[PDB]
Write a protein that binds this ligand. Structure first.
Ligand SMILES: O=C(c1ccc2c(c1)OCO2)N1CCCCCC1
Length: 282
């Protein structure tokens, strides 16, 4: 079926939970043996969210190459994304090592450091120009260059220096600050405006490594971001945009990382974002 009318048909019939459970039943199951090794327990935020072995990002390190991060490679859309968890106190150095080694231009953050009164990720970037951060375990230095605070999101320019070689790079930090503590946003308008800002920066483009995107677990909000981007791109590329099937795209992405889209409300919100976004493109 088309998307917008499949949408109204699920709303009128109140069957979002049944649609979402079908997706969960059909999703791929692949091994995640490296994630579950005992030496990696303090590298995982949640015991039930793990990268698959076949698509995990490897750190260029001979001691321990593990990070909770996955490469989502979308062949028809010609986009790639790295989806990862919010860094932990003992993985902030690994996170920036991955950014460096994969040649990413942008980092997309979809959570606040504290939500619901608890810490959802480490404070992994500097908050003041004159107070830079040094990660001694991976030999990197990170400096805040500038910061632009808007009503729904903040963009920061950061300098990352590899202290071994003295090479430096400019990394853009796109921080969506207004996703609610419970549920999903009422309108997709600000989320779409945020997506378009990330796109306009060059951070999603083939001349760079894959964008790094995260929330707390790296599957819910993060899944919504890459699912919406990929579906809108396919609607531009194809002769028949109504052929884009959002459930099929989601199942394809779930071949690369488990659990993408965590609730039936997130699934509905993803539909809403693609539907509204397709009207603005034209
Ligand atoms: O700092 C970088 C840069 C960033 C990330 C990279 C990279 C280069 O190579 C590998 O990953 N640029 C490149 C162009 C955009 C702005 C100017 C400077």
């Amino acid at each position: 079926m088309e998307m917008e009318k499949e949408f109204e048909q699920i709303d009128k019939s109140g069957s979002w939970a049944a649609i979402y459970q079908d997706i969960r039943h059909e999703a791929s199951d692949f091994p995640s043996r490296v994630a579950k090794l005992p030496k990696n327990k303090n590298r995982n935020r949640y015991r039930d969210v793990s990268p698959f072995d076949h698509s995990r990002i490897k750190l260029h390190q001979e001691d321990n190459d593990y990070i909770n991060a996955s490469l989502i490679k979308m062949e028809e859309a010609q986009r790639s994304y790295i989806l990862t968890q919010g860094p932990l106190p003992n993985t902030v150095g690994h996170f920036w090592e991955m950014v460096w080694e994969q040649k990413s231009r942008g980092v997309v953050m979809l959570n606040r450091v504290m939500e619901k009164g608890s810490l959802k990720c480490a404070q992994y970037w500097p908050q003041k120009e004159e107070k830079e951060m040094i990660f001694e375990d991976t030999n990197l230095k990170l400096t805040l260059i500038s910061e632009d605070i808007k009503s729904y999101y903040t963009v920061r320019q950061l300098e990352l220096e590899n202290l071994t070689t003295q090479e430096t790079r400019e990394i853009l930090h796109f921080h969506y600050t207004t996703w609610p503590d419970f549920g999903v946003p009422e309108s997709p308008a600000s989320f779409l405006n945020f997506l378009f800002k990330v796109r306009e920066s060059g951070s999603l483009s083939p001349e760079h490594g894959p964008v790094v995107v995260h929330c707390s677990a790296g599957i819910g909000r993060s899944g919504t971001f890459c699912l919406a981007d990929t579906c809108l791109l396919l609607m531009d590329k194809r002769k028949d945009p109504s052929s884009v099937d959002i459930k099929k795209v989601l199942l394809e992405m779930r071949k690369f990382r488990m659990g993408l889209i965590q609730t039936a409300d997130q699934l509905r919100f993803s539909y809403l974002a693609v539907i509204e976004g397709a009207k603005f493109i034209m």
